[PDB]
Every structure is written in C-alpha cells, then in structure tokens.
C-alpha cells in the first residue's frame, strides 16, 4: 500500500545520475525549440519549481507552443480504455531534444540529394538516378564461394567435464 503523494515512489527516479549533480549544461538552456519538434520529458529533480509529473518522465512528445520561459509539450496519456492528449508547459530544464527521427531525417536528405541531381541531369538529357532502395529486414544471404587457400579447420566437440573446485 503506497500513499498518494505527488512524488510517491521517487527515491530512484528523481535521484540525480552518479557523479552528475549540481548545475546542468548550458546547451539545455540554449537549445532552440520550434513548434513541431520532438522532445523527451526528463524530470530534473535539481529544479523543484515546475517539475513535471513523474508519469510523464521519459515520454516523447511534440512541441506545440513556445513561451518566453517554458516550452509547450504535447503527449498522449493512456486512460481507462482511451487515449487523451495532455498539453504541458515545461521549462527547458526538464526537456531534451529527441533523436527519434534521426535516421528518418537522414533518409529524407539522402533522397533529396538524389532528387537535386535528377532535375539537373534531365536538362542535359542523360538518364536520371534512382531513389535509394527502401529498408528491408535482414534478407536471406545469397550463395557465396569460399576459397580454400587461406582456410583452417577446428573440430568442435562436447567437452570432458572438469570439476571447478
């Protein structure tokens, strides 16, 4: 039976990282958040004012508003049998940019790099390059031939038991 306090069961969640106490980076207060960005809510217990609720810790939300001191973050909360939208205003101390679209934003740039050359190759009449191939799960490896010149064999067999003591 736990209590119903605001910060119940937070001995280890709100504890600072080992050898990571005190003031934080200045990149935390210097990062530029724009509407539509992806951020991660991380309750920094060193700052007690404006501490987001512990249920939002580690959740990835989107920026929906930018205020002089706080950033409007929008997250989905699971309720009895539905999902509701929660709109928080969190200072930049308790949020962090998310890399959830890091790989996707590279693939976006890779296809746009090829598309840029395509509109130029079309003017010159040469064939235009194809878009990068889509990602696939690890495919069955094809048949390959292994040269016997630099090969060595090691027999694998069950091992005789030896008492550790």
């Amino acid at each position: 039976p736990l209590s119903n306090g605001r910060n119940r069961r937070t001995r280890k969640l709100f504890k600072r990282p080992f050898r990571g106490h005190g003031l934080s980076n200045t990149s935390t207060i210097l990062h530029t958040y724009k509407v539509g960005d992806y951020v991660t809510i991380l309750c920094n217990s060193s700052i007690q004012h404006g501490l987001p609720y512990k249920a939002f810790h580690g959740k990835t939300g989107r920026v929906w508003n930018v205020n002089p001191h706080a950033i409007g973050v929008m997250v989905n909360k699971k309720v009895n049998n539905r999902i509701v939208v929660k709109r928080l205003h969190i200072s930049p101390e308790h949020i962090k940019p998310s890399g959830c679209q890091k790989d996707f934003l590279e693939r976006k740039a890779a296809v746009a790099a090829i598309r840029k050359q395509n509109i130029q190759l079309k003017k010159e009449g040469k064939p235009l390059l194809p878009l990068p191939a889509k990602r696939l799960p690890k495919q069955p490896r094809p048949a390959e031939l292994i040269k016997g010149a630099d090969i060595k064999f090691t027999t694998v067999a069950p091992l005789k038991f030896e008492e550790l003591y």
Binding site: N65, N67, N80, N81, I83, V85, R87, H89
Partner: protein, 60 residues
C-alpha cells in the same frame, strides 16, 4: 464478512475489446493556451486577408 479488496484480473481483456481509442487529429490542433503574441500576429493577418477577400467580392 471479509471480502477481496482488489484485483486487476480481466481488466486488460476488458480494455482491449473496444481497443484504446486514439484522439482525433483535431485534438492535436487546438490553439487555446498558445503564445499571446503569436495569437495576436495570426489574428492580424487573418483579419487582413479576410478584409481583402471581401472587397474583391464587392468588386465582382
């Protein structure tokens, strides 16, 4: 006459019959609570564009 106090049994099965209802797209596009200046800037342009659209209707 003691009774069982609590159980989460069958609760996840119940919650997934009619599965987790997602919010609609219009739930993410709400504007209440936005920046005061940004709302002031947006309203000024919308008023300007609408007033310019309406004078064209009068012209034609």
């Amino acid at each position: 006459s003691k009774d069982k106090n609590r159980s989460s049994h069958n609760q996840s099965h119940k919650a997934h019959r009619n599965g987790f209802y997602k919010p609609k797209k219009s739930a993410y596009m709400s504007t209440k609570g936005m920046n005061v200046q940004v709302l002031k800037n947006t309203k000024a342009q919308r008023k300007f564009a609408l007033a310019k659209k309406l004078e064209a209707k009068k012209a034609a």
